[model samples]
Target: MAIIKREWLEAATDAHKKLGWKAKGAVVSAHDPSDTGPDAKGYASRHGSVVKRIAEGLLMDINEGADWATSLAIEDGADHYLWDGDGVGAGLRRQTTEAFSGKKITATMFKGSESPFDEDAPYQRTIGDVFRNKRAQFYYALADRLYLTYRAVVHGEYADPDDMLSFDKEAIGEKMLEKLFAELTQIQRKFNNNGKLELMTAVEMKQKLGIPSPNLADALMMCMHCP
Candidate 1:
């Protein structure tokens, strides 16, 4: 299981900017030949469900739900073929690596083998830190989604065009803000289930989430009106 590269992740952003679509690119670390199937999305672009699951899990509770700001760069072995096929390591070999097979084309944003991310300067990533790895993954998720959201707006791929662009058309900025806030609230999930990264106190997060408190006990953990 090798750690893939970062530019490949960047390339995913490039590709999305050019192609403009809602696609995911994750790394597959461990190996298992049993992941193939007809109905599985993996058949087209397979990876250890764990890799995708990990990314998705983190996103499930994220404020923006895995912004997809940048592409997801995963770590894995032959499983890369699910998306790489003959796409990785050659021609553009320096840019991407393989996780499973091709056709599904998760595409590499950074090919690991040659990637410069080894516990050093430029990449500053670790080789054996679990907590940090999860953190790295979290930011990657955020970047990916931010980038994707921008693309969606540009392509008119919004869920509600009117809500996104109302009468005061010039105030599209405000409208977009409203739309963004709506999406954010609609997609929010529980944070710090383990209370691991409590940057904000219960009182703080609630306020930040527009959750006011006076009635903080019933069930609303951070509702602005809870207290």
Candidate 2:
């Protein structure tokens, strides 16, 4: 079963819009640096936009991925470029900083493995105790965004557009969209011995569930990450 419901995902689709509607920044997930692994992907969005456009499988080489992500941000007229800054992505972030030095676009790294920045001041009272780390916090945040969007679209509930999330299905395409849906749904949740929330790692997802890395989902999450 998926942490995020399927109906919520369906409600988040806006197929008629162009890419980067009211986009303020772009976030990329450079999953594995290896050529035989997950692809680098990204999405751009603004706080209030109903649609966020994705640019997937930009490149295999992490350096090339950075270039493509930068180009995407520039094309979207986004001044900020955020990326995964863990593992090999750490080095990629450094290289990206140098490559885009003095450019209009600025690169920032999102380290999901670290502690949540909002741990002490969570949006909800239980969030600090519920989420184990930054990754879990962000994933839940993305889920909340989708849930809000679902309520707004399906039930006509009054909600600020900035609090909802939607995807540009036309820009993401069918095959990649299916893969993204699988990745987003298959990410199971569990509690640790300490009763802290945790999510299935990419390794566990592959070994136990036969699921590939959630590269696209991660990029989308980073795009919506509060911190």
Candidate 3:
């Protein structure tokens, strides 16, 4: 197996930034303005956040009365996943869209919500009951790539740093980890400080990574969700 080197991961980050612009164009054309807000919020985040594995190459956003949006998040005609069944089955069904669209409301997928909610009805709402729907329906495709969370959700597998290295997975070394991890974590802190942990402590990360997750043993790890 081959693991991704640090340099490639950095390059892919830039590539995704560029793809965000391209993907944004597709989303606007696919949806109607009835729900999308007249003035779209921070589009860059929506564009960039679409980059992830085990997703449908989608660019999600918000519109008029609706609180959330959806789109495909694929790459080069290939779905990013260990297997077809893995991604489609375990991928994010619903997630927080307010952060990306700058909307003040929360959203969920009726298809993914609880038993009492209207499965046929749309899950996007601003003034209605917020938690009526299940959280799993609303998925965030952005974070998985940065840390390969897809492996767990999609494959029910967790490869340690060593395993990832063998597969040539996209990752940064300890030296580069400082910068890339910071970039991934700091963003959560500066912008997503909603008690989330893109920058959580190493111990937290180790639990998630399912490995030793040791780079700086003495150093503290942080959770994500900065912005």
Candidate 4:
């Protein structure tokens, strides 16, 4: 039995679920004119919040809305996330034209409303929404890597972390206990304004504690989303 990382699983599944087998291009919804007011609201915060968490760690700004967008972010033009014959070309072309070609009255008042765009929606209303989709999807890949490392450490599947695909439920449970006990002897740092004995990085664990394992190294690296 293999265990997959939570984030990686979530991203891949969501992308496939929404995009379909061969989605040539996806839609990017921008600025809902207004449900009933002089201004527009923020995009659906659900995706924004998640993307924020991931990108902030990497020091990224999802608001810029153009080339500065994250690697996985959807582009503004209808050409993005599209294929030759996904059949959405007409709609996408019309959407892009509407947003940039001739905008006169609708100013996006995103400060007060729920940000639009769901995890699977093809449309993006704001540059922020585009970034969110990219971030959300990438998480899945990283999560899978992290989980694989965890599996290697706990289970006897692989010889070690460097082994890659490897691990055991019962053995891993015991290994976790051992790792936990090892931490009890170390000096602790305040985790938050409130704290606990959080896991150490592979570098620290290897150099300071002299516990060198490939699984620990990769797991820590994957998890080290930021400095």
Candidate 5:
């Protein structure tokens, strides 16, 4: 089953009531830089604040996605920028850093195949302990945030706003929001041969469900990624 439920996501949607809210700390942006092929590149940004790190915007493009991400980061005053560091993203990461040289923004690369940030950190009982890699860990982190938001908004549970996530429906646009929901809900948890928790690969999702690469989901996960 999908890690994040539809009800949870729906509850996390903000009606652009906080449009004027500025980030208290860092405004971080992330990009899933898919090449100019079939898979579209995904870009997103979130405000790092003590209240709530709401998703501020999202973009998907095939040809000028990288350029758009850079423009968005600059426009949003993002202090930190991250991008996929595997495959085609490796070169793009270097370019991004160079482009941001002497600027206020700092760029970093994220590799899904890398080890988890802290292997000993307990997460969701023992399930998180067995995460296969950083990708799984990041995805679970997003799920945790969404679940907390759900509990707070739906069940009226007392929770710190820092522990929850919100999305700006106006910024993300209705069509893209629907696409994001479809991609996210289709993701299924899988187990490796050693019983480590993992997520289904993009290729597998495409083959089985006729879905394209989950660039949007990957970008969103990177937005939630710490460090």
Candidate 6:
């Protein structure tokens, strides 16, 4: 698959600001075809009977991967497609990729809720918690969700929003925070799953997640709390 450009991710934020929506932009990514596994199918089966239906061609077989990504961008008030399509060089591509398709999902916020996250419970997050500069609570939650969604997709358990396509989902976030948390998840995953990266203790990891305790074992708490 083609490497997604940074600007396309940025465009989501631009659209978010222009439209003044509480959550902004449709984030998109390309997944390697090989990675979509059986576990993902099992996860999707919990919600519905069906699983992924692979298409006839490589995901990047379309317009340098922009054809798919652009439609997602347009869903949230964006039109700028930064990728050059078929002509993009290999070096420009993101080495790490996702399943056939994935999208971040968000519940609508209501007047009674400060954030759409109240349903996540225990670790139910607040809008105030995200902005206090208090270590990494909100951002960590955001990263964990994205990481989980990515894992779901790679394992072939992604839920389908478009029926034929089982999409991995994540919660929405501010532009900067969104970008930061996504990369953090990437790094964290590498640190744990890849031997080349440095490993941190449970205590250090909890500090990164902003929990009061060392173990990240609070089952009632969701990495993200949303409406």
Clashes of each: 48, 0, 59, 26, 0, 15
* Residue-level lDDT for 43 in candidate 4: 16
Please estimate how well model 4 matches the true structure, expressed as its whole-model Cα lDDT.
Answer: 0.25
lDDT by residue for model 3 (64-145), tens? 2122222221212211111111112123323324223443222222222232223355443421132222211111112334
What range of 10 consecutive residues in model 3 has the weakest lDDT sum?
Answer: 217-226
Off by over 4 Å in 6: 1-121, 124-135, 159-227
TM-score of 5: 0.84
Best by TM-score: 5
User: Whole-model lDDT for model 2 versus the true structure?
Assistant: 0.64
Model 1 lDDT, full chain set: 0.24
The model with the greatest lDDT is 5
Superposition error at 199 for model 3 (Å) = 15
Give the lowest summed-lDDT range of ten residues in model 1.
218-227
lDDT for each residue of candidate 5 in 109-210, tens digit (9 for 90 to 100): 888878777777676445445898888888888888878777877786765666677776766677777777777787778758877878887777778778
Cand. 3 Cα-lDDT:
0.24
**Model 2 per-residue lDDT tens digits across residues 52-130:** 4455654446677767766656655555567777756776766777766777666667777777766877556556677
lDDT of 6 at 198: 26
Model 5 — which ten-residue stretch has the worst lDDT?
49-58
**Each model's lDDT:** 0.24, 0.64, 0.24, 0.25, 0.70, 0.26
The C-alpha stretches of model 2 lying farther than 4 A from their native spots are 15-48, 122-126
Clashing pairs in 5: none
Q: Give stretches of model 5 more than 4 Å off.
A: 15-23, 49-64, 124-128
Worst lDDT window (10 residues) for model 6?
Answer: 38-47
| Candidate 4: residue 81 lDDT (0-100) | 19
- Tens-digit lDDT string for candidate 4 (83-122): 1111111223333334444332121211111222243455
